Each structure stands twice: as C-alpha cells, then as structure tokens.
Amino acid sequence: SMSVKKPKRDDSKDLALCSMILTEMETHEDAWPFLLPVNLKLVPGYKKVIKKPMDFSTIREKLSSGQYPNLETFALDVRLVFDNCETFNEDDSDIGRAGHNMRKYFEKKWTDTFK
Structure with missing residues (x-):
C-alpha cells in the first residue's frame, strides 16, 4: 500500500532473459507452426475464430520495441x-x-x- 513495499526484486535482466528464452523457442525443431503469423487470407475460419492471434515473430517485435511492461x-x-x-x-x-x-x-x- 502507500509507503509499504515488499523488498525490491531485481528485474534489470528480465528483458535479456525473456529474449534468450524466445531464441530457444524459435530454434526448437517443433517451432515451425508458431514462427510467423497465421495467414488470415489463406486459412479459413482463423480470423473469425481466433480473436487474438499471436506468434513468435510478433512477440519478438513487441519485445524489441518495449511493448512488454513486465x-x-x-x-x-x-x-x-x-x-x-x-x-x-x-x-x-x-x-x-x-x-x-x-x-x-x-x-x-x-x-x-x-x-
């Protein structure tokens, strides 16, 4: 609450560490369905059914541009x-x-x- 805080966890390496994890996911042999956005013109039903598409290359771009607050x-x-x-x-x-x-x-x- 106001003027009452838990001890400060060191979050200074989080950015780098999430980047490493994402690299490790990208290089996994089973990553291929997830590397790029699903093509919404070419995959019937996807646009309507999946309300929030997400893929590894989109996470990378968000990460690299300061769009993750934590x-x-x-x-x-x-x-x-x-x-x-x-x-x-x-x-x-x-x-x-x-x-x-x-x-x-x-x-x-x-x-x-x-x-």
Missing part, C-alpha cells in the same frame, strides 16, 4: 500462442502435438529461469 505480460503472449493452437488444432495432429511440446518446453525454461 515479464508476466511476455509469458501471457507466449501462452496465447499455445492456447490459440489448442483452440484450432486437434490434439492428434502434427500441429496439435507441436503446441503441447512447445508449451512444456517453455514452462520448464520459465520456472528454471525465474521461479
């Missing part, structure tokens, strides 16, 4: 990528499995770097 808003957008994937793709598909695998890969890196 590391939680960064995690929210990564999770959005996987939640979108789950909404549109059957679990038993290459893309569906890719999203599961990447969500796991991310959640571990996230816990290991910050928790």
Whole structure:
C-alpha cells in the first residue's frame, strides 16, 4: 500500500532473459507452426475464430520495441500462442502435438529461469 513495499526484486535482466528464452523457442525443431503469423487470407475460419492471434515473430517485435511492461505480460503472449493452437488444432495432429511440446518446453525454461 502507500509507503509499504515488499523488498525490491531485481528485474534489470528480465528483458535479456525473456529474449534468450524466445531464441530457444524459435530454434526448437517443433517451432515451425508458431514462427510467423497465421495467414488470415489463406486459412479459413482463423480470423473469425481466433480473436487474438499471436506468434513468435510478433512477440519478438513487441519485445524489441518495449511493448512488454513486465515479464508476466511476455509469458501471457507466449501462452496465447499455445492456447490459440489448442483452440484450432486437434490434439492428434502434427500441429496439435507441436503446441503441447512447445508449451512444456517453455514452462520448464520459465520456472528454471525465474521461479
């Protein structure tokens, strides 16, 4: 509350650390469904169904331009990528499995770097 603060967690490396994580996601062999925005002209149903599209290259551009106010808003957008994937793709598909695998890969890196 006013004039009552918890001890200051050092957040000075968060930017760099989220950038490293994103690099590691980008270079994963199962990243290919997530690297670029889904083409809304060429994928029937996507524009209507997925209200907030998100992909790795869009997170990179947001990150590099100071559009994440803190590391939680960064995690929210990564999770959005996987939640979108789950909404549109059957679990038993290459893309569906890719999203599961990447969500796991991310959640571990996230816990290991910050928790």
